[PDB]
């Protein structure tokens, strides 16, 4: 499974350019899905199987990034975030565009000194990105105004360890993509590749239970609730103020767990019936996120031993 | 090219199934292309020629339609749109799906108060489709959860007029299939049969096939003004680059001077690009209408200017 999480992973796909990671996901899928659609809302909807019950699995594709919005003569660019990125996770860092193009992030201070205030309270209006242009039309060409970046960081193994960018949430994108290469569904199973909704503002098919498939930070890092920890499984979500018939969901998956003696953790936190199963995952909205890959095939495990019979 | 138009709007091909569209076009290019290629998602990509410039020509397969969302107890399907189908366009309608099952649209409240006021309201939850099963189980053997369907409309002759589904933009593939067919090519000539909307094709320009609104009916939209039988529509873009001007400009002096009738279309852009497209009425609708002498005046404009 690690060659799809490398692609998916690397995959370019900021909030407002995720195209690139839909055509991954559906050649992925190629072979194991009886079809697909792209819903009116931008959704993948892909599905496999026809039980009676209908199961959604549920993983946002869009990634963290920035968003260019001026350019100065001489071809250096202003930057927002996009998504929850911070502006320390930027110093020295280089950046993907959509076109190839490789930028490098610094920092505005005429002097030793103003440089060092700047860095004890650092400001997107202090950065800029470097793309090797020389005049503000020969920037606008390569990254226009509008244009979304990325991490320029990929793929690589440490130790046991799997690290990279936008493991929230490729990884459950890729558990996702993974149940339908291996399953035999005894439900309708649906996976639904969405965009989160920009913060300052439902499924195309109606089904009998959706199970998102998240990350979930994992609070086992120096000087550090009873929190989630790598190796540990999948995390099960106990939400306060769940139904019925969600709360049934859950005692499924701990239940299969248990009888199959697969490792899970309970994370508590400090209309289709729902349940969410997170991936531990250590440095969330950094370039080297960092996942343990049993934790990801027990995930896969719980959710084919669930909806495949 | 009455048989071609046919043949092509017939097809089904709603977004995802294409496949009966792809053959079509390739049966009816054998001979006329140089090779071909279906990429990953299902474009069809042909050519012809070995001129130096290189030009694409673009119109894009996939027609509007239906999905099988769900199958009740009594066999009843429950559907939501593919593209942009209206819920007015399918009252009283048959559907057909790929295996050639076909299915009534019925909408849902038997009382004819709350009958007059479902259609007011219209949503694709007050309507079903019965495919004369009687149970989940005959339903869901004929036609599965996931199912796709198109208007159950075929080709038909209305007084000069063609009338068919699927117009947009079967139509625009006629045009590319008739300019491969007939033409000698002083360019290299693709021809990009797109789904669900680079092609791996370096290109110099690239010209995209398409249906306008022809808005001469009555209480026509006021905004729009091209008519049937004023030839093929060149789009003005208010914001082309040099290159694309240029294409437009070029297209202009064939059809002034080899006396084409063709119409102006009036309101990162890296391969220059122009728009020519077919006036089609009553666009979306199970009964889409052209007038063959624009899609002929569009195949003239495109042979004169890519070769002979």
Same mark, same amino acid.
Request: glycine residues 10%; contains cysteine.
């Given at each position: ?6 692609? !998916? ?16 996901? !559906? ?65 020295? =860092? ?21 440089? &060092? ?22 920037? &606008? ?39 339908? =290469?291996?399953? %035999? ?51 099960? =979500? ?12 859950? $005692? ?5 767990? $248990?009888?199959?003696?697969? %490792? ?46």
């Amino acid at each position: 499974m690690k060659e799809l999480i490398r692609k !998916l992973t690397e995959a370019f796909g900021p909030s407002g350019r995720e195209e690139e990671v839909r055509s991954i996901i !559906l050649e992925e899928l190629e072979g194991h899905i009886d079809g697909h659609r792209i819903d009116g809302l931008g959704n993948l909807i892909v599905w496999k199987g026809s039980g009676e019950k209908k199961v959604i699995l549920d993983a946002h594709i869009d990634e963290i990034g920035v968003v260019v919005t001026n350019v100065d003569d001489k071809g250096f660019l202003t930057i927002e975030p996009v998504g929850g990125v911070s502006p320390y996770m930027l110093l020295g =860092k280089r950046i993907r565009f959509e076109n190839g193009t490789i930028g490098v992030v610094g920092m505005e201070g005429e002097t030793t000194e103003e440089r &060092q205030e700047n860095v004890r309270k650092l400001s997107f209006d202090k950065l800029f990105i470097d793309i090797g242009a020389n005049s503000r039309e020969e920037a &606008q060409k390569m990254c226009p105004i509008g244009s979304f970046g990325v991490y320029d960081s990929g793929f690589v193994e440490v130790s046991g360890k799997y690290v990279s960018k936008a493991m929230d949430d490729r990884i459950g994108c890729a558990v996702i993509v993974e149940v339908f =290469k291996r399953i %035999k569904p005894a439900v309708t199973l649906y996976g639904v590749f969405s965009v989160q909704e920009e913060v300052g503002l439902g499924y195309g098919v109606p089904a009998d239970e959706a199970i998102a498939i998240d990350v979930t930070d994992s609070a086992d890092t120096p000087k550090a609730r009873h929190a989630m920890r790598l190796s540990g499984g999948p995390a099960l =979500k106990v939400k306060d103020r769940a139904s019925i018939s969600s709360k049934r969901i859950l $005692e499924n998956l701990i239940e299969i767990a $248990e009888k199959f003696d697969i %490792k899970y953790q309970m994370e508590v936190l400090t209309g289709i019936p729902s349940a969410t199963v997170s991936i531990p995952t250590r440095y969330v909205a950094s370039p080297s996120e960092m996942i343990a890959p049993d934790d990801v095939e027990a995930t896969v495990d719980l959710l084919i031993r669930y909806l495949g019979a």
